């Protein structure tokens, strides 16, 4: 089936540039325009521009003229977008999408590429075990936590007992704290489950090539 | 440029309801109006093209209608897999423009939060920092208030609150409230308290602990 | 030589797609090219299939627009005489 495969997440400092890619397969590349679309918190969905793969002819949203440059390598069926002079408002998810012509719908989309523009450096998380208060908790159930603090950039993956524990889990969206991210997750089990069984929070931070296992021990 | 306006950014309904999402064009776009669905994982798919035409593969409960500048997307009977964000798009004129999007959420009965407080880990204290965490779990509606008290005195600085997306199982919300202090400041106080106030009760839910014990 | 006996019909149901089909030219074809053209450039649709494919679906035709459909074997050879179709 038609597939648009975009390149991975990017972290770039303000003022610098970035070039992201969209590799098409499952159809004749020159049969369709390739488009780029921006999804941001400030302005939602915006059309950046399109390009004709056969000859590289481009059409731009004037709002992105001087920001985005579209190119193609038809021999490898890959479209490219280069963003320059990056700022906070450029932090967004960028999609590639095809159409036959601009009056026709975007019938296939890439999976999106997340761009983060920040001066903050790549930083591995500190992982802290959250055990219940030292001395009695009301109820037949018990809630444990995992605090994932001071990492950059997004994302992290957090699991409990390597996926064996999946019910009763809440993983809260990460929040910026002095330009670094902090995340927590809670898991709730019966008192019969913990501490008689081991419960471990598993944290992976791909950007720093980090994996951490933290067993939750009684205080 | 043509401006596409989706006045409602967030819409709550019950499963099985007839849900209608509106879209407005700043000027005549004929019937060049498409609808896209974005799932929580970021995947985007075409749903409706040319105002009312159903894209291949899309369930028949989806339909569209228009009137030149007024357009609507209708789900005849809302299913759980329909929980997503929906965008309209005009293709009449360059540059192509989108609506701001309408996110669907589910209604359910009110539920009081389950509250748990967590002192800083001994590990974190070794770093010179101290985070006190309060979980407010499985409540409805999303609106909720948390108050932090240190040694009997209210504390507002250093608090960050994060809400989960609506739970895909029981349609409740959860929120984490984190009070972050320095190690030194944390150790200059003893009693730490978090108080949750929700419409389910006039009485707040109070969880506390003492640092020394 | 152009592809023979070009057929054009609605892929129907209640959508908007058409189905374009053909026979090979008389008398080695590597590709077939289809042009689905409207009165303006913005309606232009290009489609390409391999030499062993003899039908293709073209979705999303604009209603009320008179389209011409041409097919060529492969740049490309002589185009079939244009046939026309217009959806409600």
From Swiss-Prot, chain C:
Belongs to the immunoglobulin superfamily. ROBO family. It comes from Homo sapiens. Homodimer. Dimerization is mediated by the extracellular domain and is independent of SLIT liganding. Interacts with SLIT1. Interacts with SLIT2. Interacts with FLRT3. Interacts with MYO9B (via Rho-GAP domain). Glycans are attached at residues 14, 39, 46. It is linked to Neurooculorenal syndrome: An autosomal recessive syndrome characterized by variable clinical features including congenital renal anomalies, neurodevelopmental defects, intellectual impairment, cardiac defects, and ocular anomalies. Some affected individuals present in utero with renal agenesis and structural brain abnormalities incompatible with life. Nystagmus 8, congenital, autosomal recessive: A form of nystagmus, a condition defined as conjugated, spontaneous and involuntary ocular oscillations that appear at birth or during the first three months of life. Other associated features may include mildly decreased visual acuity, strabismus, astigmatism, and occasionally head nodding. NYS8 patients manifest bilateral horizontal nystagmus in the absence of other neurologic signs or symptoms. Brain imaging is normal. Maps within a region of overlapping homozygous deletions characterized in both small cell lung cancer cell lines (SCLC) and in a breast cancer cell line. The promoter region of ROBO1 shows complete hypermethylation of CpG sites in the BT-20 breast tumor cell lines, some primary invasive breast carcinomasa and some primary clear cell renal cell carcinomas (CC-RCC). Residues 2-88 form the Fibronectin type-III domain. Receptor for SLIT1 and SLIT2 that mediates cellular responses to molecular guidance cues in cellular migration, including axonal navigation at the ventral midline of the neural tube and projection of axons to different regions during neuronal development. Interaction with the intracellular domain of FLRT3 mediates axon attraction towards cells expressing NTN1. In axon growth cones, the silencing of the attractive effect of NTN1 by SLIT2 may require the formation of a ROBO1-DCC complex. This is Roundabout homolog 1. Ubiquitinated. May be deubiquitinated by USP33. It is found in: Cell membrane; Cell projection, Axon; Endoplasmic reticulum-Golgi intermediate compartment membrane. Widely expressed, with exception of kidney.
């Amino acid at each position: 089936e038609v597939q648009l495969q975009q390149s991975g997440p990017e972290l770039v400092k303000p003022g610098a540039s970035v070039k992201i890619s969209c590799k098409a397969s499952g159809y004749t590349f020159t049969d369709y325009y390739m488009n780029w679309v921006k999804l941001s918190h400030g302005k939602s969905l915006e059309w950046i521009g399109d390009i004709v793969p056969n000859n590289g002819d481009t059409t731009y949203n004037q709002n992105f003229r001087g920001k985005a440059t579209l190119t193609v390598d038809k021999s490898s069926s890959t479209a490219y977008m280069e963003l320059r002079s990056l700022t906070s408002e450029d932090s967004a998810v960028y999609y590639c999408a095809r159409f036959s012509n601009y009056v026709y719908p975007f019938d296939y989309w890439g999976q999106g590429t997340t761009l983060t523009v920040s001066s903050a450096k790549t930083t591995a998380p500190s992982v802290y075990p959250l055990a219940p208060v030292c001395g009695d908790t009301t109820g037949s159930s018990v809630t444990l936590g995992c605090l994932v603090k001071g990492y950059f950039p997004e994302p992290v993956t957090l699991t409990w007992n390597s996926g064996s524990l999946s019910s009763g889990v809440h993983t809260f969206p990460a929040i910026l704290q002095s330009d670094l991210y902090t995340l927590s997750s809670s898991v709730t089990v019966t008192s019969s489950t913990w501490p008689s069984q081991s419960i471990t929070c598993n944290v992976a931070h791909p950007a720093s090539s980090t994996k951490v296992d933290k067993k939750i021990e009684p205080r | 440029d043509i401006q596409m306006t989706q006045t409602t950014s967030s819409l709550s309904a019950s499963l099985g309801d007839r849900v209608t999402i509106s879209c407005r064009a700043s000027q005549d776009i004929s019937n060049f109006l498409n609808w896209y669905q974005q799932k929580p994982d970021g995947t985007v798919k075409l749903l409706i093209y040319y105002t009312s035409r159903l894209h291949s593969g899309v369930p028949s409960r989806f339909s569209g209608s228009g009137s030149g500048t007024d357009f609507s997307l209708t789900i005849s009977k809302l299913e759980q897999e329909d929980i997503a964000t929906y965008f309209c798009q005009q293709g009449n004129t360059l540059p192509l423009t989108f609506g701001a999007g309408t996110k669907l959420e589910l209604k359910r009965a009110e539920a009081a939060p389950t509250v748990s407080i967590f002192p800083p880990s001994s590990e974190q204290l070794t770093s010179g920092g101290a985070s006190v965490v309060c979980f407010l779990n499985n409540f409805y509606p999303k609106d909720i208030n948390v108050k932090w008290k240190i040694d009997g005195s209210e504390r507002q600085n250093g608090v960050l609150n994060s809400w989960t997306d609506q739970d895909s199982k029981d349609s409740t919300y959860s929120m984490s409230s984190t009070l972050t202090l320095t190690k030194d400041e944390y150790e200059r106080h003893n009693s730490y308290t978090c108080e949750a106030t929700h419409k389910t009760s006039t009485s707040p839910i109070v969880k506390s602990f003492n640092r020394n014990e | 030589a152009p592809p023979q006996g070009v057929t054009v019909s609605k892929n129907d149901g209640n959508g908007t797609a058409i189905l374009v089909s053909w026979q090979p030219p008389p008398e080695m074809v590597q590709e077939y090219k289809v042009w689905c053209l409207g009165n303006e450039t913005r309606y232009h649709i290009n489609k390409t299939v391999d030499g062993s494919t003899f039908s293709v679906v073209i979705p999303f035709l604009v209603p009320g627009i008179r389209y011409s459909v041409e097919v060529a074997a492969s740049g490309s050879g002589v185009k079939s005489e244009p046939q026309f179709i217009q959806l409600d």
